[PDB]
Scaffold this active site. Structure first.
Site, PDB file in Angstrom:
ATOM      1  N   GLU A  47       0.731  -1.304  -0.077  1.00  0.00           N
ATOM      2  CA  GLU A  47      -0.047  -0.011   0.033  1.00  0.00           C
ATOM      3  C   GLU A  47       0.822   1.301  -0.021  1.00  0.00           C
ATOM      4  O   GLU A  47       0.596   2.088  -0.793  1.00  0.00           O
ATOM      5  CB  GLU A  47      -0.886  -0.037   1.116  1.00  0.00           C
ATOM      6  N   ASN A 102      -7.524   8.995  -5.710  1.00  0.00           N
ATOM      7  CA  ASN A 102      -8.319   8.013  -6.700  1.00  0.00           C
ATOM      8  C   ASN A 102      -9.359   8.495  -7.661  1.00  0.00           C
ATOM      9  O   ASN A 102      -9.627   9.885  -7.767  1.00  0.00           O
ATOM     10  CB  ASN A 102      -9.429   7.202  -5.669  1.00  0.00           C
ATOM     11  N   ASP A 157     -12.425   8.449  -8.488  1.00  0.00           N
ATOM     12  CA  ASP A 157     -13.591   8.910  -7.947  1.00  0.00           C
ATOM     13  C   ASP A 157     -13.423  10.341  -6.979  1.00  0.00           C
ATOM     14  O   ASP A 157     -14.410  10.864  -6.534  1.00  0.00           O
ATOM     15  CB  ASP A 157     -14.340   7.994  -7.187  1.00  0.00           C
ATOM     16  N   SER A 162     -11.569  10.768  -4.161  1.00  0.00           N
ATOM     17  CA  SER A 162     -11.300  10.502  -2.827  1.00  0.00           C
ATOM     18  C   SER A 162      -9.579  10.402  -2.955  1.00  0.00           C
ATOM     19  O   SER A 162      -9.086  10.330  -3.850  1.00  0.00           O
ATOM     20  CB  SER A 162     -11.677   9.197  -2.187  1.00  0.00           C
ATOM     21  N   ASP A 189      -6.275   8.377  -0.528  1.00  0.00           N
ATOM     22  CA  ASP A 189      -5.856   7.269   0.564  1.00  0.00           C
ATOM     23  C   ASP A 189      -4.574   7.827   1.012  1.00  0.00           C
ATOM     24  O   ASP A 189      -3.842   8.498   0.529  1.00  0.00           O
ATOM     25  CB  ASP A 189      -5.351   5.992  -0.565  1.00  0.00           C
ATOM     26  N   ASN A 233      -8.966   5.416   2.960  1.00  0.00           N
ATOM     27  CA  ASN A 233      -9.777   6.271   1.923  1.00  0.00           C
ATOM     28  C   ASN A 233     -10.492   7.399   2.602  1.00  0.00           C
ATOM     29  O   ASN A 233     -11.193   7.121   3.638  1.00  0.00           O
ATOM     30  CB  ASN A 233     -10.685   5.427   0.816  1.00  0.00           C
ATOM     31  N   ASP A 248     -15.532  -4.451   9.465  1.00  0.00           N
ATOM     32  CA  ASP A 248     -16.833  -3.890   8.726  1.00  0.00           C
ATOM     33  C   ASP A 248     -17.519  -5.086   7.871  1.00  0.00           C
ATOM     34  O   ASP A 248     -18.501  -4.983   7.596  1.00  0.00           O
ATOM     35  CB  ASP A 248     -16.336  -2.814   7.690  1.00  0.00           C
TER      36      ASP A 248
END
Length: 129
Positions: A35, A46, A48, A50, A52, A59, A101
């Protein structure tokens, strides 16, 4: 901060990731390697919109506030900058929520694609733990 491999392993263990939700320490170290290359200040935008953040590339659409991700949540109740600290507490505590989650470590695409089912114990080989 750029952690050494065994240094990050020790930090993650101190903060309670070893076997957290059944994921051995090697999984976490492996995830961090791919990562962020163990770099707390890693950021990646990203498609979209967003971003990281940190050693585990958490995110901004769900987990932290960066003030620029429309329609996002802040489920870890932290500014995303908290995830870039030399102190990895914010990243760890937030990762604990994420991994709890539903999808376990599959939440980390790099973990699924590069660590899942491999000899993850290799990542803590030779470390004082």
């Amino acid at each position: 901060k750029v952690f050494g491999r065994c240094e990050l392993a020790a930090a993650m263990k101190r903060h309670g990731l070893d076997n957290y939700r059944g994921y051995s320490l090697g999984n976490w170290v492996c995830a961090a390697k791919f990562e962020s290359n163990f770099n707390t200040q890693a950021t990646n935008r990203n498609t979209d919109g967003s971003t990281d953040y940190g050693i585990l590339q958490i995110n901004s659409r769900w987990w932290c506030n960066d003030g620029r991700t429309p329609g996002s949540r802040n489920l870890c109740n932290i500014p995303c900058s908290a995830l870039l600290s030399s102190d990895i507490t914010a990243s760890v505590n937030c990762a604990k929520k994420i991994v709890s989650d539903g999808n376990g470590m599959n939440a980390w695409v790099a973990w699924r694609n590069r660590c899942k089912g491999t000899d993850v114990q290799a990542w803590i080989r030779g470390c004082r733990l």
